[PDB]
Symmetry: C2
Subunit: 106 residues, 2 copies
């Protein structure tokens, strides 16, 4: 049951976290009306969110003699730095990076 | 006093290790002669030598956001593998490799 787009398949994954601004009615009429209130004060909210994940690693103990292939940046000069902001403040990811650079036997 | 060709300069470096085959004279004459012996049995020796060095490392704790430059092998196909033997059994080192790939501030 490994997910086909990649990753870890779990029967009990991290739960969904749901959030909502509590409605605040505007001034109701001074005579009773049984219909649900339709007039509300315009509101929004802001805040900080933190997520901390501990990951377990599995180290390599290869006996390969020659050097491996490694992900690296290229020294050649360019207008911008890869994985940084440009002059207008926009961050970008210039390429997809996988995980398979070290090698193992079958 | 860092050595100019590179490395660690020490007042008491690893000591010199000196080895020699003990001379074995051939048959001496049966009348006494005071001159030093000039005829020897032709000998040589062979064996195994082992050296074990413990090195202390100083790890990086950089806060740099973008990926670093790393030494890597190139995937492009070739007749031989770099840092391996060829069809005749000869090992070769195709290039010099330094130590300065990670980065630090001044």
């Amino acid at each position: 049951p490994s997910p086909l787009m990649g990753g870890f398949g779990m029967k009990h994954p991290p739960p969904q976290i749901l959030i909502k601004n509590t409605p605040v009615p505007a001034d109701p009429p001074t005579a009773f009306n049984k219909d649900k209130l339709n007039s509300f004060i315009t509101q929004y909210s802001t805040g900080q969110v933190s997520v901390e994940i501990e990951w377990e690693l599995q180290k390599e103990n290869s006996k390969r003699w020659n050097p491996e292939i490694q992900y690296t940046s290229n020294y050649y000069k360019s207008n911008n730095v890869e994985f940084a902001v440009n002059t207008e403040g926009v961050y970008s990811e210039p390429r997809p990076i996988g995980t398979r650079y070290l090698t193992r036997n079958l």
